[PDB]
């Protein structure tokens, strides 16, 4: 029982069969001496009388659109959502967990203050997501998230397609700092046409960094069957590269790491490949870039 937005209320209904539901008092916001009639979209006929109606919410049948009518006109409308609760644990059914049993996957390409948060829905009718910085202190770091958009990268889990939603967010500060102390915490308000679910996450912007592959991987022949593999820093990575550094991994197709932008090794007759990673933290590795032997 709380007001999500104007004339939109949400209730917490326990999903136990024998358990009783909640009682809701809904009042049309205009007074008239004439008795106020009530109508619903999930039910037929007049359901209420007077300006105040009591509803025993027990299931998704007792939710939806409630309208107050007088004479031959309407006065106001008020929605009503549900929030499932099961054995004390709130439901998580709109979203599908990733491979690592998490719901929200956020990734940043550099130390610029912008990132991308994505999730995996289960069905695709009437989803209205909303991502915002769930502040809990006056000094909490604040982000300005954008509108959630569909992505055409249908992922495969359980040998089954799952459709992917993505949103772009950017943290803004008065002037940037040297390190990160208070983690970014985010809240998602998912809803499926009557059903309301709340998700939450918290992370730093340093353990979610996923760099880009090297852009110009080439190859120089040298004497006695030994060659040179050279690459370059990605153009999307933060500048300068002396302060933000990387360690690259080289594998011939078990790999050895190189801190310089040039390595030498003998070939086997197949595609040699490099990937990038942050030197200090154990951040996520990049996708490989390659060059034929």
């Amino acid at each position: 029982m709380w007001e999500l937005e104007k004339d939109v209320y949400v209730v917490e209904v326990d999903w136990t069969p024998d358990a009783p539901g909640e009682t809701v008092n809904l009042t049309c916001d205009t007074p008239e001496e004439d008795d106020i009639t009530w109508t619903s979209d999930q039910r037929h006929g007049v359901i209420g009388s007077g300006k105040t109606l009591t509803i025993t919410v027990k299931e998704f049948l007792d939710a939806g659109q409630y309208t107050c009518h007088k004479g031959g006109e309407t006065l106001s409308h008020s929605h009503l959502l549900l929030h499932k609760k099961e054995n004390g644990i709130w439901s998580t059914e709109i979203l599908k967990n990733f491979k690592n049993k998490t719901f929200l996957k956020c990734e940043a390409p550099n130390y610029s203050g912008r990132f991308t948060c994505s999730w995996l829905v289960q069905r695709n009718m009437d989803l209205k997501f909303n991502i915002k910085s769930s502040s809990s202190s006056p000094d909490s770091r604040a982000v300005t998230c954008g509108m959630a958009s569909l992505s055409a990268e249908k992922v495969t889990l359980d040998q089954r397609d799952y459709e992917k939603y993505s949103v772009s967010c950017q943290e803004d500060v008065t002037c940037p700092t040297a390190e990160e102390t208070l983690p970014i915490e985010l809240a998602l308000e998912a809803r499926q046409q009557n059903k309301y679910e709340n998700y939450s996450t918290s992370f730093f912007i340093r353990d979610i960094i996923k760099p880009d592959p090297p852009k110009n991987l080439q190859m120089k022949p040298l004497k006695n069957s030994q060659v040179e593999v050279s690459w370059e820093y990605p153009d999307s990575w933060s500048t300068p590269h002396s302060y933000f550094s990387l360690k690259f991994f080289v594998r011939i197709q078990g790999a050895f790491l190189v801190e310089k932008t040039s390595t030498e090794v003998q070939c086997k007759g197949g595609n040699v490949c490099v990937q990038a990673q942050d030197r200090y933290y154990n951040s996520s590795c990049s996708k490989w870039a390659c060059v034929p032997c």
Binding site: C175, A178, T181, L182
Partner: protein, 157 residues
Amino acid sequence: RCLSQSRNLLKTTDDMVKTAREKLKHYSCTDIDHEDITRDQTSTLKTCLPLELHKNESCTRGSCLPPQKTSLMMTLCLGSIYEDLKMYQTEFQAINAALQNHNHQQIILDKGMLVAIDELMQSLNHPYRVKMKLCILLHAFSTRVVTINRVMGYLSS
């Protein structure tokens, strides 16, 4: 230069924290409880940044800064790093003294990081509560030494 000593300090800190990660895993190191030691001589968070991201001015002297890269905020950066290291070294010596005096050998503070801090110093100027305090001090010092390595690598190379 001081960069090699800084990398040695990073390696020793990583080794000792990875040992503490199983030796004191049950106390508080398994949540993270990010709290640091100083909030008011913590100028490193505002000055130790490259001179290409300093958009606004709102954000000892040292003897290891090269003269090919001389600036105004860099001396404050190195002085604040020195003062933060002074506080960290004082607290680490105190906690080591309080840790050897009891009959529990389930933790060791190797002197490699202590002497690494000491040479970084000399180059830069010419019960149960103690172990969890050590865990939180390490959880702050890891990010501190990463920041120090970043700024000194930018300053030297």
